Amino acid sequence: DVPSKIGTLLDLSATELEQVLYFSKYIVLDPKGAILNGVPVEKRQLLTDEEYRELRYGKQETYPLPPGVDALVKDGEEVVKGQELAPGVVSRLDGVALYRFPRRVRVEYVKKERAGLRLPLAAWVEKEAYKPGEILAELPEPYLFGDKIVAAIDPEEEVIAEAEGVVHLHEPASILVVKARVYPFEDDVEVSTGDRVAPGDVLADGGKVKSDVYGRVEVDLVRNVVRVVESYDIDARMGAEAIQQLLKELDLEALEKELLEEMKHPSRARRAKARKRLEVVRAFLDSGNRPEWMILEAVPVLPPDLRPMVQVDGGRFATSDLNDLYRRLINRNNRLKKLLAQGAPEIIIRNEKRMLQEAVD
Amino acid sequence: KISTSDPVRQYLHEIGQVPLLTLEEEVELARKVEEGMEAIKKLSEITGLDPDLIREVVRAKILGSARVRHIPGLKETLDPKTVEEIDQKLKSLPKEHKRYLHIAREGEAARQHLIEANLRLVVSIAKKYTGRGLSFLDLIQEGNQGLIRAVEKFEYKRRFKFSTYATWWIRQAINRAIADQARTIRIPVHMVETINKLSRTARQLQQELGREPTYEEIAEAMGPGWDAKRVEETLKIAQEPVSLETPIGDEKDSFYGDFIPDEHLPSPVDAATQSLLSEELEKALSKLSEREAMVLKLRKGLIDGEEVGAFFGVTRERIRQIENKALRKLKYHESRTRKLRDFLD
Ligand SMILES: [Mg+2]
Ligand SMILES: [Mg+2]
Ligand SMILES: [Mg+2]
Ligand SMILES: [Mg+2]
Ligand SMILES: [Mg+2]
Ligand SMILES: [Mg+2]
Ligand SMILES: [Mg+2]
Ligand SMILES: [Mg+2]
Ligand SMILES: [Mg+2]
Ligand SMILES: [Mg+2]
Ligand SMILES: [Mg+2]
Ligand SMILES: [Mg+2]
Ligand SMILES: [Mg+2]
Ligand SMILES: [Mg+2]
Ligand SMILES: [Mg+2]
Ligand SMILES: [Mg+2]
Ligand SMILES: [Mg+2]
Ligand SMILES: [Mg+2]
Ligand SMILES: [Mg+2]
Ligand SMILES: [Mg+2]
Ligand SMILES: [Mg+2]
Ligand SMILES: [Mg+2]
Ligand SMILES: [Mg+2]
Ligand SMILES: [Mg+2]
Ligand SMILES: [Mg+2]
Ligand SMILES: [Mg+2]
Ligand SMILES: [Mg+2]
Ligand SMILES: [Mg+2]
Ligand SMILES: [Mg+2]
Ligand SMILES: [Mg+2]
Numbered sequence: 177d178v179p180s181k182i183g184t185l186l187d188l189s190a191t192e193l194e195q196v197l198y199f200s201k202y203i204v205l206d207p208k209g210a211i212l213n214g215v216p217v218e219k220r221q222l223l224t225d226e227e228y229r230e231l232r233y234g235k236q237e238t239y240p241l242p243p244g245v246d247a248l249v250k251d252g253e254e255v256v257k258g259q260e261l262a263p264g265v266v267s268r269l270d271g272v273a274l275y276r277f278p279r280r281v282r283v284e285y286v287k288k289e290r291a292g293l294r295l296p297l298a299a300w301v302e303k304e305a306y307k308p309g310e311i312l313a314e315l316p317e318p319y320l321f322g323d324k325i326v327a328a329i330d331p332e333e334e335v336i337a338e339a340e341g342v343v344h345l346h347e348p349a350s351i352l353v354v355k356a357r358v359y360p361f362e363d364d365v366e367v368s369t370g371d372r373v374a375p376g377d378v379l380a381d382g383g384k385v386k387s388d389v390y391g392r393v394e395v396d397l398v399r400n401v402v403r404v405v406e407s408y409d410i411d412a413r414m415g416a417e418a419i420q421q422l423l424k425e426l427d428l429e430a431l432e433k434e435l436l437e438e439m440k441h442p443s444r445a446r447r448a449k450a451r452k453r454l455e456v457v458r459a460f461l462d463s464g465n466r467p468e469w470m471i472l473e474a475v476p477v478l479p480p481d482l483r484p485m486v487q488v489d490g491g492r493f494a495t496s497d498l499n500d501l502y503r504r505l506i507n508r509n510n511r512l513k514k515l516l517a518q519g520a521p522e523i524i525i526r527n528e529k530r531m532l533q534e535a536v537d
Numbered sequence: 538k539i540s541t542s543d544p545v546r547q548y549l550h551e552i553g554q555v556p557l558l559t560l561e562e563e564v565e566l567a568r569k570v571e572e573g574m575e576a577i578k579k580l581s582e583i584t585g586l587d588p589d590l591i592r593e594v595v596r597a598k599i600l601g602s603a604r605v606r607h608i609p610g611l612k613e614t615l616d617p618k619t620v621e622e623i624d625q626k627l628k629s630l631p632k633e634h635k636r637y638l639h640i641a642r643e644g645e646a647a648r649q650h651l652i653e654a655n656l657r658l659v660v661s662i663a664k665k666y667t668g669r670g671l672s673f674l675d676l677i678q679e680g681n682q683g684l685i686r687a688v689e690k691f692e693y694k695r696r697f698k699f700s701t702y703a704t705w706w707i708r709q710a711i712n713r714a715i716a717d718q719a720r721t722i723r724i725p726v727h728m729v730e731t732i733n734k735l736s737r738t739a740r741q742l743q744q745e746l747g748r749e750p751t752y753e754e755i756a757e758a759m760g761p762g763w764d765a766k767r768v769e770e771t772l773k774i775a776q777e778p779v780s781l782e783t784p785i786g787d788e789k790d791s792f793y794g795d796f797i798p799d800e801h802l803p804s805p806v807d808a809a810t811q812s813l814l815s816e817e818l819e820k821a822l823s824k825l826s827e828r829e830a831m832v833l834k835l836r837k838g839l840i841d842g843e844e845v846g847a848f849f850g851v852t853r854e855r856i857r858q859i860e861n862k863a864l865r866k867l868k869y870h871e872s873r874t875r876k877l878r879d880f881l882d
């Protein structure tokens with residue numbers, strides 16, 4: 177309605193802040209969300225997919241993966257494992273791989289020039305080290321005069337029974353801007369955060385785990401590398417969900433008194449806005465019913481004989497056009513539920529919540 | 538702002554920032570998905586917990602907080618205390634089995650970077666089953682559900698990659714959706730193909746006679762057991778519901794619904810009949826005795842239209858006895874004080 181009845185009361189951009197989070201995804205920080213954009217958490221403010229993406233995973237998802245096999249696979253690697261890469265890490269080989277953001281590095285796959293210091297994959301391939309304790313002798317001719325394989329004997333991401341389970345390819349140099357901890361320790365004041373030397377790992381796993389102000393925890397049992405990324409429980413929400421919340425947490429009385437003040441004292445402009453905002457709050461607050469209801473979580477369905485299914489001519493049936501919209505709503509709703517269960521990639525849930533939203537219109 | 542474009546920009550944007558590498562990234566995530574399964578089963582093994590419980594606890598720890606579990610499925614799992622207890626045993630699993638907990642999680646997450654990357658696959662496919670009677674967004678979405686279906690079964694051991702795989706697992710999901718939701722009145726997949734066949738046959742027959750086929754053609758050309766009663770029936774089921782609301786006559790405010798009469802409602806002549814019929818029948822029923830009149834009055838009037846089973850202890854011959862002798866005296870005086878004859882129907 178011109179005056180947004182939910183915008184006038186919830187001081188949100190009366191007509192556009194709503195449109196923004198209602199139908200698509202422009203998240204409104206509902207409760208606390210401690211970490212910065214540059215300034216404090218936006219109590220009642222709205223951010224984008226992109227900056228929000230930059231809030232949860234950490235500031236930088238850079239996936240620079242190299243060409244061919246030798247040049248960049250070498251510059252990247254010598255400076256990749258644990259070597260805290262600074263910003264503008266100028267990797268040296270094609271063009272100039274440019275790692276322009278923050279804290280530690282994880283490179284992804286190797287090919288076959290020289291094999292040193294890498295994880296358990298190749299170990300079983302060249303039996304010597306996984307079979308017995310040969311790896312040392314594996315360095316080949318100067319040992320007569322942790323990993324360190326032969327001078328250059330293996331090629332791809334394979335399993336060597338017969339070379340049968342394989343995969344010949346690329347090598348990502350994905351900089352993960354996060355802080356990597358190898359030997360955390362146990363201090364019991366709050367419950368034990370993060371990790372113990374090597375034995376106990378109390379951190380939740382490579383998914384969601386909140387330790388100190390930094391809040392994500394990935395785990396790499398290769399070295400005891402408890403990858404701790406940094407954002408917190410930022411209650412980011414979009415759609416009716418975020419407005420049902422916001423509408424419950426409001427004591428109209430407070431807004432009635434505040435507006436009383438805003439109304440008579442400051443100059444016209446903002447006080448003028450408050451008097452038009454005091455109307456709805458007072459009505460809600462007078463003999464009128466209470467305002468959490470503007471939200472619909474349970475859709476009434478008009479009578480059956482009122483939306484007939486009639487036999488017209490031969491086989492022609494005829495029904496009240498409402499039944500097509502009702503199927504709309506019902507199907508979407510159910511597909512929604514099924515898509516939440518089956519597992520939920522984010523875009524697809526939104527895309528549907530969107531469709532469902534419109535249907536309810 | 539008009540929907541299709543936003544979604545398209547949305548998942549095309551994320552694909553843009555992350556397609557999956559032909560091999561490396563489809564293989565990587567696949568392998569993690571599987572070890573997740575292998576991990577969750579072994580987890581049930583050691584915990585006595587149902588693989589369903591292990592699956593929802595790891596999903597809550599990876600996909601979302603109390604928020605997710607409480608609103609979607611209503612509260613059977615306690616929001617905080619319950620799943621937390623489950624994660625606790627997961628921790629207590631020593632070096633050996635903790636491994637699986639840490640794997641299950643990463644596997645679940647892996648499952649997601651694979652589903653994101655292949656949303657363009659869906660849309661491109663879904664872009665062709667467009668004019669069936671489903672919304673593009675509805676279509677892509679069911680197809681999306683199919684791709685997730687594919688993720689469950691992909692065996693990376695068998696070398697073929699996810700592309701050709703999602704293609705089938707999606708095309709199935711979409712063809713079902715189109716058959717299950719595209720109509721206002723649910724028809725089986727057999728009656729759908731049947732209709733398509735009938736339609737296609739009518740097409741071939743519209744190829745040469747210059748006679749939109751008498752349904753004689755249709756039966757022949759379709760095959761074995763097709764006859765006229767059939768095709769007439771089929772095309773009658775084909776036609777879609779016309780609108781109870783449609784322009785009428787010399788198109789103006791006349792809406793189609795005022796034209797259609799009503800049939801359960803007693804139009805005043807019927808309420809009047811019921812009154813007289815009830816009072817007159819009720820007067821007669823009183824001038825009989827209860828036993829076999831109430832038996833046939835209730836047996837007929839009260840419940841379901843059983844001579845033997847109609848009367849209590851008393852057998853058939855007292856039934857018929859009274860049935861037919863009270864029934865006739867009731868008629869024969871109803872004949873004298875004629876109240877009932879004018880047929881009230
Ligand atoms: Mg916070
Ligand atoms: Mg993460
Ligand atoms: Mg070479
Ligand atoms: Mg390292
Ligand atoms: Mg060049
Ligand atoms: Mg750059
Ligand atoms: Mg940093
Ligand atoms: Mg190698
Ligand atoms: Mg190793
Ligand atoms: Mg390897
Ligand atoms: Mg060797
Ligand atoms: Mg020697
Ligand atoms: Mg070599
Ligand atoms: Mg090869
Ligand atoms: Mg290769
Ligand atoms: Mg510490
Ligand atoms: Mg601490
Ligand atoms: Mg321990
Ligand atoms: Mg924990
Ligand atoms: Mg550890
Ligand atoms: Mg006052
Ligand atoms: Mg007041
Ligand atoms: Mg009907
Ligand atoms: Mg109507
Ligand atoms: Mg695996
Ligand atoms: Mg055992
Ligand atoms: Mg047991
Ligand atoms: Mg949710
Ligand atoms: Mg609750
Ligand atoms: Mg609810």
Ligand SMILES: [Mg+2]
Nearest residue numbers: 615617618619
């Ligand atoms: Mg308690």
Ligand SMILES: [Mg+2]
Nearest residue numbers: 686687689690
């Ligand atoms: Mg399936």
Ligand SMILES: [Mg+2]
Nearest residue numbers: 340342695696
């Ligand atoms: Mg193979």
Ligand SMILES: [Mg+2]
Nearest residue numbers: 658699700701
């Ligand atoms: Mg493809």
Ligand SMILES: [Mg+2]
Nearest residue numbers: 726727728730
């Ligand atoms: Mg069939």
Ligand SMILES: [Mg+2]
Nearest residue numbers: 751752765769
């Ligand atoms: Mg005929």
Ligand SMILES: [Mg+2]
Nearest residue numbers: 759760761762
């Ligand atoms: Mg047949």
Ligand SMILES: [Mg+2]
Nearest residue numbers: 772773775776
């Ligand atoms: Mg017809």
Ligand SMILES: [Mg+2]
Nearest residue numbers: 791792793795
């Ligand atoms: Mg009308």
Ligand SMILES: [Mg+2]
Nearest residue numbers: 799800801802
């Ligand atoms: Mg009627």
Ligand SMILES: [Mg+2]
Nearest residue numbers: 486487799800
């Ligand atoms: Mg009728």
Ligand SMILES: [Mg+2]
Nearest residue numbers: 818819820822
């Ligand atoms: Mg009677």
Ligand SMILES: [Mg+2]
Nearest residue numbers: 843844846847
């Ligand atoms: Mg009976």
Ligand SMILES: [Mg+2]
Nearest residue numbers: 846847848849
């Ligand atoms: Mg009996």
Ligand SMILES: [Mg+2]
Nearest residue numbers: 870871873874
């Ligand atoms: Mg008489």
Ligand SMILES: [Mg+2]
Nearest residue numbers: 866869870873
């Ligand atoms: Mg007499």
